[PDB]
Amino acid sequence: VVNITYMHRLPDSKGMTLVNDIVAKWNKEHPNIQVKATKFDGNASEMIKKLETDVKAGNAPDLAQVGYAEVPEVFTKGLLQDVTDEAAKYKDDFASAPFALMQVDGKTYGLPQDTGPLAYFYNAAEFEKLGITVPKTADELIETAKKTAAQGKYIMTFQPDEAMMMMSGQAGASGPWYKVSWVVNTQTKGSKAVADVYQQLIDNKAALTNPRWDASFDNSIQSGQLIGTVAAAWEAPLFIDSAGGTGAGEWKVTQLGDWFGNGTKTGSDGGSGVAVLKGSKHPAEAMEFLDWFNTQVDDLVSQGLVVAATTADAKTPQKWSDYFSGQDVMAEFKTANDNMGDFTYMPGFSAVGAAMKQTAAKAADGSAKVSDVFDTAQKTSVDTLKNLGLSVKE
Numbered sequence: 001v002v003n004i005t006y007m008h009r010l011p012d013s014k015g016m017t018l019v020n021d022i023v024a025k026w027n028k029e030h031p032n033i034q035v036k037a038t039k040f041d042g043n044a045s046e047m048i049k050k051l052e053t054d055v056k057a058g059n060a061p062d063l064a065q066v067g068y069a070e071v072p073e074v075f076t077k078g079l080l081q082d083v084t085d086e087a088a089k090y091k092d093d094f095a096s097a098p099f100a101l102m103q104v105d106g107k108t109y110g111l112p113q114d115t116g117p118l119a120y121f122y123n124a125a126e127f128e129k130l131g132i133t134v135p136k137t138a139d140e141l142i143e144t145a146k147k148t149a150a151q152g153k154y155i156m157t158f159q160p161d162e163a164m165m166m167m168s169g170q171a172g173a174s175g176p177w178y179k180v181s182w183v184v185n186t187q188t189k190g191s192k193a194v195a196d197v198y199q200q201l202i203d204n205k206a207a208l209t210n211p212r213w214d215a216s217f218d219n220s221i222q223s224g225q226l227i228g229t230v231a232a233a234w235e236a237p238l239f240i241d242s243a244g245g246t247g248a249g250e251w252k253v254t255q256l257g258d259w260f261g262n263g264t265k266t267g268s269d270g271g272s273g274v275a276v277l278k279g280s281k282h283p284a285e286a287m288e289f290l291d292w293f294n295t296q297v298d299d300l301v302s303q304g305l306v307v308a309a310t311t312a313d314a315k316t317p318q319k320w321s322d323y324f325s326g327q328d329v330m331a332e333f334k335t336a337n338d339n340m341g342d343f344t345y346m347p348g349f350s351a352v353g354a355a356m357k358q359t360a361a362k363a364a365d366g367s368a369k370v371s372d373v374f375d376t377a378q379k380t381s382v383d384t385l386k387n388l389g390l391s392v393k394e
């Protein structure tokens with residue numbers, strides 16, 4: 001018997017199809033390839049560091065969730081095992097764009113699992129009650145956000161603890177920060193647009209500045225104070241659970257608007273693959289399981305995933321459609337995915353993220369400017385690449 005270990009950070013929230021129950025199906029079918037999946041016991045940003053100490057000690061799993069934005073980091077630290085020939089067998093099960101983000105220099109290190117396009121969640125019933133529409137332009141966004149804020153209702157958030165992806169995603173919808181020497185410019189037209197829009201919203205107290213993962217964010221939904229936010233597609237079931245029933249049958253999803261010089265494009269906020277790590281003695285069996293696991297479309301959608309698999313179209317779960325006004329929100333998430341700008345990540349992006357969070361907390365409380373978050377991103381980007389002894393231009 002070949003024994004495969006898979007470490008994931010999928011939510012496994014009550015009501016979801018739990019990873020262990022999906023893996024149980026494979027294990028009954030495949031006596032000779034027995035998989036143990038475990039949910040990483042930590043916050044998402046601690047997982048790569050735990051994989052790094054596991055590889056050093058030799059208690060690394062065969063498979064591990066790795067964000068596409070983490071692939072360059074774990075590649076450069078030598079944690080990944082080349083499984084190019086295994087991946088080629090499964091390539092035709094997966095969308096080309098996310099499959100390519102599991103590759104470095106024409107070698108493949110795993111299979112893509114999901115994408116994280118940004119979209120816009122809103123209470124459509126409350127918009128109708130307030131006599132507003134989803135704003136088409138940045139000027140309409142700011143005007144309408146002031147109009148709801150004047151009734152104690154908020155249509156935007158600025159999430160200091162999600163600076164890394166909310167700021168890079170909204171800004172990155174209109175162009176890259178990083179071009180590969182590395183050429184670094186986090187102060188693009190898109191960065192300036194996002195800084196300008198969020199600075200107006202914060203200055204006019206027309207966005208909520210609660211951290212995404214704090215109780216204050218949840219209380220903002222449940223109280224009916226929060227009636228619109230940019231959101232990564234995978235937040236859908238997490239948002240519903242955070243709502244505490246508030247908004248049930250009233251919410252909808254639409255595309256990120258043309259607010260940041262992005263037109264009909266959106267940005268990337270997470271999205272992950274599963275990598276084969278250094279040390280796996282059974283990469284063929286690991287990748288055969290992984291291809292199966294990542295093509296269990298309905299099971300993976302239940303965890304909030306906008307699946308990378310092309311084998312079967314993703315449907316909206318009944319509970320999500322119940323919450324979102326009967327809307328097929330997954331159809332919106334697929335459109336958003338199709339419209340998501342390419343956005344190369346540098347190795348060490350997570351250190352950039354860490355410094356952006358601290359600046360963003362100051363932007364929220366008014367002791368910094370939102371534009372300072374993108375200056376932080378520039379300095380930390382260049383310093384991180386120099387410290388990895390990489391050639392940088394700025």
Ligand SMILES: CC(=O)N[C@H]1[C@H](O[C@H]2[C@@H](O)[C@@H](CO)O[C@@H](O[C@H]3[C@H](O)[C@@H](O)[C@H](O)O[C@@H]3CO)[C@@H]2O)O[C@H](CO)[C@@H](O)[C@@H]1O[C@@H]1O[C@H](CO)[C@H](O)[C@H](O)[C@H]1O
Binds near residue numbers: 213
């Ligand atoms: C990109 C990503 O992995 N997103 C995660 C999300 O991760 C952020 C949160 O853990 C917040 C909590 O404060 O921290 C962010 O890390 C900061 C950290 O706060 C700082 O202290 C540190 O110094 O800097 C880092 C940045 O380097 C994390 O980035 O957490 C959520 C909630 O657990 C995850 O859902 C999300 O990952 C997505 O999960 C989906 C399943 O729910 C999918 O698997 C998707 O592909 C993931 O991207």
